[model samples]
Target: SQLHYTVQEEQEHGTFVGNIAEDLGLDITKLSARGFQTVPNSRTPYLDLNLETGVLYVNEKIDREQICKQSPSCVLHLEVFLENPLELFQVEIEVLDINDNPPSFPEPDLTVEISESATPGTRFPLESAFDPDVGTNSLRDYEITPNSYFSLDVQTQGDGNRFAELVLEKPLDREQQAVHRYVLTAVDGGGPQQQRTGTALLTIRVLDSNDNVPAFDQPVYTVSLPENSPPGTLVIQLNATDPDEGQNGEVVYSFSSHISPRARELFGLSPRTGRLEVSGELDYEESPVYQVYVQAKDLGPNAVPAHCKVLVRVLDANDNAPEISFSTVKEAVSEGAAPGTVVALFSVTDRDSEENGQVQCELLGDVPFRLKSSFKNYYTIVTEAPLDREAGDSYTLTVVARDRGEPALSTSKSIQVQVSDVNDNAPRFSQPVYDVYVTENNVPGAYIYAVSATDRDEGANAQLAYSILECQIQGMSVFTYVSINSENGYLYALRSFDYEQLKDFSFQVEARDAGSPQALAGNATVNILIVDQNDNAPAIVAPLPGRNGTPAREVLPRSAEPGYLLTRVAAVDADDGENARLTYSIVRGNEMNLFRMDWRTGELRTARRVPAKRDPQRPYELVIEVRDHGQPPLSSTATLVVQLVD
Candidate 1:
């Protein structure tokens, strides 16, 4: 156990107390990094723990009377907490006494009645002075103004309290002095020269005759009142009577010397009506019961006083609710953070004592966070498990603090925590591969295909940019042929394609996310087929001319039999599939009806006989044409000459 540190009350703020680091054998530099702090149950802060110097000092001035009230031991309790290994220490600070307060009587003046016939050495008790300070700082001695007839006698009680009384030094004669006035001074046991003191006027009335003693109708009064009763609220009224007539029968009330100063401070007795009223605010939490002694004295000189006891019970009330506040170091956490990472720290307070002040905290809803109570009402909100930004982006955790009082009071506070994203998930394409067919001679820069991907992350972690993987097409970079829109994943052809040159090609596309430092990516294959178009015409390369590039001459017999082969016409096309298929046909130039032609093969033959070449030397003219099987047929023509021979 650590010894308590003591400091005189009413000290200046920032008054140095002691070096906590040196006392505890801890490194001063590590205090800040370890999150060193002091948590007091009270709402007001009294001490400051310097992180740099590791010194404990006064944050605010503390008044011993104000803090402890009636309690003699004014000690401040604090819990010193250090994070990073999670340690706790207990600290107690005692506020020492300072003679700043003066001793004073409850009332400014006092009246005492004595008979002139009374003998010497007779004593009359006087009310004691009240001093809030303890030990040597409290009221000690009493002195009365110089008087030959009366002397002051100081008496001590078992509880270390002192009171004063007036002793009759000589007999008083009413004929010589009808009344006597003296000043009574109450002094405290502070410094000899600077001791504090208070004075009250004491009026001594010398009575000449005897009278019946006043007596209360009831000896005791019991009353129950709610706490926090307003000032001047009536507690009870008293009726006292004296058998003697006139002045002797009239009763005046006052607090008896036996009543405690605390009770006297809270309640007052009216002199004329003998009515007891509340003089100050009452709190059940501070003091629940008060016993007061009331005295009723008649105005007549030498009249006896009547005393009664009053018991005041203050009823409890639920006037406080749970108060909550947060100490957040970070408002956001990484999704990849480890479990049990602290997100926030909080504490709950309630002013009511006993069960009404006991509080419990609960975190509502299903979240990744859970609360761990530290000391008393302090709590820490930590992650229960690893978090995923894709599942949830942020959380508004509502913490409800409820006290254990009847008809409990609860307070709710919302703590917003942001779940930052991590590049945990790679981009994924919607499909494994994309097959697209584009017609030959399509418009360049047109959208041929679109590759899309998705990422289950947030912010820049899910931002995607599209690109085509490196490859070569026809000895050229594939990028030279096709490009992708980086933001939207739109694929575009850079150049028009021909089916003859590039029938089909396949390449891969990547969708990469724009994550910081390191980015994640996914790949998908794209196959493109160039559809054929009838863009080529058939060409006939046969039937050579005599010397130049012209039709060729063939000799045939005029007696040539049927089915005699003469020549065949050949042609070809540049396109493939149905666009490249060719058909041959003969155009009419054999007007004699003696020569015939085969359309499928384009062969020239003699039907019956060449029958008479109209001129033996003049050959018969025949034209052959080859057409491709396309949407629009494309054809080429060639002419052949036939000469008849005997």
Candidate 2:
């Protein structure tokens, strides 16, 4: 296409115009710069137009940001005219945008926190920054505020992007301060000013460690309890203190290791507050003076523990309740769980000596939990039922532990059981059949029809996907003409349709779910009926040209009387109805009204007798135009070779 197809006049130091001589089918002498020019009254006069050669040049610099903003390309329009053969042409020049924009992050603030439990030199990576500009204009470096306890580490990350991490210089103590704040500024490679800087605030909380042991207010404690004391009965109020703050100062009270087994069952301790209480049955006759070892522990990850002693003098009277403790238990349960699944492992004890110390545990419910004795006073809670998640998804049960004292002593704990969901239902289409009518030659990528399906299940089971089945319509394999949107249920026309090629069609579509084992497909039949449009041009079907075909010849002696019929001309059109209807007229080579034609029937005739002064031997031509009556009608030319003999 760029070959030397044209010849241009000699020029110096100017825009190169292609050879207009060769393109105009003439020599350099005939083709000059004055023969042609761009059209007049153009809106954007941003180009230097050459007349004869028709070469265009950029005459002015443009501000792309002001003209087209961030668009990749901008078109400049212009028009010029030629005076000699009087012609005008419209021209367009597409100017593409270059890399002239600076990089910027839409989001300005980034922040994070680090715990004091982190080791020295510990690093915490922040979220990667964003930049609108690509390549070198993207993120380049990051600056962190100087702090004795913190440092910044920047490294070249994947894809040559710069990443930053906040590092600790040493451990922090909560006694000094609870939190530390730092500032981070991310800088891109764009030019100076705040335009290239993105700032964020970082805060770190210093958590307390269990570095100090708890100290009880008194090394030895004394308390008295009646044998008839009920469960949760307070015997004595104790207190302990820790120098460290937060979790390290939170104290829990319990019976120490040195305490007798019976003594532990006879009392309970508050894990959140240092308080000793009566938890089980007690008898002064069995044990008058009980030496109980008590321990105070903090709630830190590695807690420091303190010890003390409690001497309880019991006054004999009546019964006390049994105490139960759980060793391990699950906080949540998934739906569709099997029976005999262990829910908890626990043990129980009673303060009543000998036979009274015997304990039994059981779950009392019509619900799904049951207890099985594993050892002396030890039991396991297991499932007794199972089902699906329809709406009401959880249950609660009561676990009771009892001791056989003179009067039965009992205690109960309520356990909450939560049930989760699983995929089980497939997607269902709203209707089994759908029908639609679309005009032929609809716009590509236009909306057609939407299909929808209902899913009863939630979460993964309810997620549905739409797909066109078999990629066909009426078995014609017109897959390219249409497509189904994967997310929504809408069908899209990828290209315009032609009813002349295909009249009507039907296709299958499917609605499926993303459930386990893949939810079965719900299918339906879609009928597409095509509507006719006036898109085809009228096709003239006469005077079929070939070597073997004879031209329509009619002999006229040129002395024919007025109003004589010469011959009949006829043609057909391929279009339908009004579009197929035709008319005829002589458009060219008819001198002095020498011929006439019937517009509807296309019959050729002699309008009047030939003039006597006309040249005899000169041949004549008749160019008849056959046209249709449709809107913006189409036509073709047919020549009837007529000879007039004297």
Candidate 1's residue-wise lDDT over 463-567, tens digit each?
A: 999988999989989998889999999889888888889989999899999889689998999998888888888887665666776677787766668778887
Best by TM-score: 1
Per-residue lDDT tens digits for candidate 2, residues 1-646, read 1222121111223434343335445444444545554445674434455544445544444545566654434566555444567655444455543334543434445445555566888887766665444455556777778889878888884866776777788887666777787676777765422346677666676766677778887888887777767888888888788877777677788777898998788888877776778888666657777888988888777776789898888865435578888898785766567888787888787766666667777677777677888578888888776655665377776788877666777899877767666666667787787876787778888888888887777677788889888765544566676788878988777777777677667778888877775565578877777666656565445545435544455567776777788766667665566666788888886778877889787777778788873435656768788877876577777666667765
Compared with the true structure, all predictions reach lDDT values of 0.84, 0.69
Give me the displacement of residue 84 in model 2, in angstroms. Answer: 99
Candidate 1: which stretches are off by over 4 Å?
1-210, 216-224, 229-234, 237-243, 255-281, 285-293, 307-311, 436-450, 453-456, 484-496, 541-548, 552-570, 592-617, 631-633, 642-646
Instruction: Report the C-alpha displacement of residue 223, candidate 1, in angstroms.
Output: 4.9
Question: In model 1, which residue pairs have backbone atoms overlapping below 3 Å?
Answer: none
RMSD of 2: 70.7
Instruction: Show the colliding residue pairs in model 2.
Output: 6-19, 7-19, 33-52, 38-80, 38-81, 39-79, 39-80, 39-89
TM-score of each: 0.58, 0.34
